[PDB]
Each structure stands twice: as C-alpha cells, then as structure tokens.
From Swiss-Prot:
The chain holds residues 324 to 609 of 624 of the full protein. It comes from Homo sapiens. Belongs to the KEAP1 family. The gene is KEAP1. Broadly expressed, with highest levels in skeletal muscle. It is found in: Cytoplasm; Nucleus. Kelch repeats lie at residues 4-49, 50-100, 101-147, 148-194, 195-241, 242-286. This is Kelch-like ECH-associated protein 1.
C-alpha cells in the first residue's frame, strides 16, 4: 500500500531536474527535490527503499554532457546524494536490479555505442564490469524475470534492433532470445506477471503505439492492445498489476499523457497528465 510512481529528469527544450511522484490511489502528484544535475535519457530504479538515477545526459542550451553519474534519493529525507559513478558515461541507458544489485546496460557516450555492462553493489558503493552483451545497444529496454536480466531492442551504431538477449548472473554470460516482431529503439520495457512487455519506441521511420509481450515458456513475442499515443523515449513501470507509460515523443510533441494497461481486459486508458510534457525520464516505484 501507498507506493508511489517516481519520475526523474527528462527533456523538454533541455534536460530537466524535476523529481515528481504520482499516487494512483488518489490521483495526486508530489513535487520533490530537484536532481543536483539535469538529466534526460537516464534510468530509474529502487533498491531497499532508495531511488537511483543512473546515467543519461545533460542536454543544455550551452551543449551536451553524457553522464556516468549514480545519484541516490531518500524519500524520507527528500535529499539527493552522489554515489560512486559508473566506469563510463551511459546516455540512453537500460537498468535492472537483481538481488539488490543495479545493472547499467549499454547506452552511449558521444560516438561510443556500448556493449558493456556494469554492476553496482550499494553496500560497498562500487561498480564492476560484468560480461558484455552480444550486441551494442543504446536506447535499450531492460527487464528482470526469474533472476535473469533481459535487454530488448535499441540501436547498435548501424542497425535499429528487434533482437533481445538474456543475462545469466550466476554464469555471467548472455544468450540471444527470440527477437521482437518489431524493430524498437527507445521502447518502454517492464515485467508484469511473468511476461516482458515492450511498449512503443522508434522503428527507424515512425514512433510506435504497438506493444509486444514475451512469454518465457513458448519464448515468443505476441502483440497486445496498442497504446492510444505513439511514443518513444517513454517512462514505464508497473503498479498494482498494471503497466504505466509516462510521456515520450510522439513524432511532433513531447507528451504529458500517462496511459495505464490492464492485463485482465487488454485495454489502455489515459489515467492522468504529468505537470508538463517530456521524454527520456527515469521511472521507478517505492
Ligand atoms: C528524432 O526522432 C527520434 C528518433 C529516435 C528516438 S529513440 O527514442 O529511439 N532513441 C534511441 C536511439 F539512441 F536508439 F536512437 C533516443 C534518442 N534520444 C533520446 N533523448 C536524448 C538524446 O538525444 O540523447 S530525449 O528524451 O531527451 C529526446 C530529445 C529530443 C527528441 O526530439 C527528437 C526526442 C527525445 C533518447 C532518450 C532515451 C531513450 C532513447 C533516446 C527518439 C526520437
Ligand atoms: Na525497464
């Protein structure tokens, strides 16, 4: 009870510092302490009641700086603190948590299109390199299922990807899985009831409203109901058995639309609006 959807950073004309939290119970938005540095193309995650803001970029009017930063938010203190930075800057990053460890997956540093992956141990405040992905992936979506980390879609420096791969932390190795039916970079990727969902993204021509679900048993991707709005660089999370997608770019506009997926009825509904339209946010629930 009383867990909130947090949204951190994002982009509208420049990278933003906002940290806001939505309560799906009462439909209320909280305005919380700003990030110390503006960030878009970051990822959000929660470990032991703390929210982490990982990687991304400060896209200023001045210019662009890719971020290696890891910053920790305590909802009890409403304060951001720096943590150990990653080995490399990672903009358009994917993250997932396994057993209280943060995995920072691919992303970019200028022309560098990362295949590398690194793991954070909060108790030691250190990062270590682990096995690299079999593909370079920026704009990659990450999901954790059955204690395996999945990396889905992205861009390899030449090709936009429908490919996906699976990381085995005990073995420290990656394996290609069944590809998506759609090429998707900047997709929202999340886990709901033992399925991976990949919602929206960009196929190289258009922003997508399509949604595919991965079934681990049959190892296949199937389409479910599409979103009302085409969106890439969207935020995504799961709250009480439902998927929330936040913002993104629809090909013309930076969206403020929050849609909600009910797996029971296979329908999307608009549930609220962010206070302002933005893409490339980091989202998590605690
Ligand atoms: C021009 O039309 C497109 C084309 C592909 C995409 S994307 O969603 O596939 N893609 C992934 C990839 F790297 F693979 F190309 C991404 C592109 N840009 C991001 N941002 C930061 C950045 O430019 O570095 S963003 O949210 O601040 C942003 C900023 C401006 C914008 O105006 C077009 C759209 C977005 C990304 C941030 C997170 C994830 C992927 C990002 C988006 C828009
Ligand atoms: Na994810």
């Amino acid at each position: 009870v009383g867990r909130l959807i947090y949204t951190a950073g994002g982009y509208f004309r420049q990278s933003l510092s906002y940290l806001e939290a939505y309560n799906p119970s009462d439909g209320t938005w909280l305005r919380l302490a700003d990030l110390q540095v503006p960030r878009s193309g970051l990822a959000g995650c929660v470990v032991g009641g703390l929210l982490y803001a990982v990687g991304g970029r400060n896209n200023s009017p001045d210019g662009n700086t890719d971020s290696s930063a890891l910053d920790c938010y305590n909802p009890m203190t409403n304060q951001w603190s720096p943590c150990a930075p990653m080995s490399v800057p990672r903009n358009r990053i994917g993250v997932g948590v396994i057993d209280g460890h943060i995995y920072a997956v691919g992303g970019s540093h200028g022309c560098i299109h990362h295949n590398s992956v690194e793991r954070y141990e909060p108790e030691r405040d250190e990062w270590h390199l682990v096995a690299p992905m079999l593909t370079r992936r920026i704009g990659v979506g990450v999901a954790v299922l059955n204690r395996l980390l999945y990396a889905v879609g992205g861009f390899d420096g030449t090709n936009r990807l429908n490919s996906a791969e699976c990381y085995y932390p005990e073995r420290n190795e990656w394996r290609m899985i069944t590809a998506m039916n759609t090429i998707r970079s900047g997709a929202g990727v999340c886990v709901l009831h033992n399925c991976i969902y990949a919602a929206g993204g960009y196929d190289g021509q258009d922003q997508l409203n399509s949604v595919e679900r991965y079934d681990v048993a049959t190892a296949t991707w199937t389409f479910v109901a599409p979103m009302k709005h085409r969106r890439s660089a969207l935020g995504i999370t799961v709250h009480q058995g439902r998927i929330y997608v936040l913002g993104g770019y629809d090909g013309h506009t930076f969206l403020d639309s929050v849609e909600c997926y009910d797996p029971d009825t296979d329908t999307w509904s608009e549930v609220t609006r962010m206070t302002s339209g933005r893409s490339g946010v980091g989202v998590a629930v605690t």
